[PDB]
Every structure is written in C-alpha cells, then in structure tokens.
Amino acid sequence: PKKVLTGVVVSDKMQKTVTVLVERQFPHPLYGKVIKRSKKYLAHDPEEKYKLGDVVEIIESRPISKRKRFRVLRLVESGRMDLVEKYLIRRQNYQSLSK
C-alpha cells in the first residue's frame, strides 16, 4: 500500500505546495502513557485549490521535489483555523527561550 496520512494545512505560501501537520500517537515504550507526535509534510498541490486551515490528507507518491513525496488525496474538514492558530502559536513561543 501507499501510505495515507492526515493533517492540517499550515503553509500555502509555497507555489503549488502545502505543508500539513500529520500528528500521530502511540503508547510510550516503557511508561505506557500514550504520546502524541507531530511531523510537517510537504505536499504537492497541482492547482493550489487547498487553502490554509484545511484538514486534508496526503498520499505516498513519486518524488516531485527535494522534499515533496506526497500530494493531497482529498480534502475533508475545512476552515479549521483553531488548529493553525495552535501551531502557529507554538512557534510564537519560541522567540522567547532564546538568549
């Protein structure tokens, strides 16, 4: 199978490409408590139909950049700006631990 993953748009500042937040979760290898992990995927968008905050999902495919290996398979949810707001915020934090 080609892997199919699911995430939220966070970048349409790229021509014909979109970044998406593929969260994932599993139980801890020693401590049982399940954990959630995240990994931004660069996903090709043939006609930048997809806008920000869209909950869509990707598709394993042939390389079309240095980093694009996936495309949008199909949109599902839409206008989910709360989520972009919660990850944009995560970065906003960063410029504060610096020295």
């Binding site: 801890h28 401590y31 049982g32 408590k33 954990i35």
Partner: protein, 122 residues
C-alpha cells in the same frame, strides 16, 4: 516524579568512573621506575612501605606498591603493574607483579607462592 514528568525528563543512567585509568582498558601496562622509596601509611598504621613511581608505555607516570619480603627494584627497572589499590597508602592504585621483567619474585616463600613470582622449590 509523575509519569508525564517521567515521559519528559526521563530517568537517568549514571556511569562508573574507572578506578584504574592509567591502565587504559588494559589488564596491565609496562613501564620503568623513576624512583624507589619508602613511605609511611596513614592513620592508624605505621610501617615503611616500599613503592615506586612508574613512567609508563601509555605516556603516564603513576604510583605503585611493591609487595613481598623485600625487593630488588631500583630506578630504570623495566616492570609491570596490574590493578590493585592499597587501603592505607593513599594514592597507590597499582601493584607491581613480581616475577615478570626486571622485578623478579620474592625469595623463600612457599605458602601463597603463585601470587609472588616464586617458583616451586624442591
């Protein structure tokens, strides 16, 4: 800690320091003597103990004990040390193996003999 705290900061393994660093992972290192002298034990013992400063193959320069009923050793004696601390000699963490190299094993021992480079007599 709570499991989450645990998840985050995690437990932490601790390493043992190798109490015989001059070995450099070996079982023994060769070397020469620079000085053979006697030296008093700390509290609460008293006796002139025989030691040796040994300049090593490993570029080192360490202190070592000479066990036995007297010894021959003088400076420039090719020699060999193995791990082993003396309790009441602060600092000494190595013993010269009697018998190998220019440090040959003690005369006229018969009991516990193999630990002192003496052959079996007949």
């Amino acid at each position: 800690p709570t499991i989450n705290q645990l998840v985050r900061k995690g437990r932490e393994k601790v390493r043992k320091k190798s109490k015989v660093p001059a070995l450099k992972g070996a079982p023994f290192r060769r070397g020469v003597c620079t000085v053979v002298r006697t030296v008093t034990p700390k509290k609460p013992n008293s006796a002139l103990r025989k030691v040796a400063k040994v300049r090593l193959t490993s570029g080192y320069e360490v202190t070592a004990y000479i066990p036995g009923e007297g010894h021959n050793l003088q400076e420039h004696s090719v020699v060999l040390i193995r791990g082993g601390r003396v309790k009441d000699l602060p600092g000494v963490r190595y013993h010269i193996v009697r018998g190998v190299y220019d440090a040959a094993g003690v005369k006229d021992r018969k009991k516990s003999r193999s630990k002192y480079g003496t052959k079996k007599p007949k």
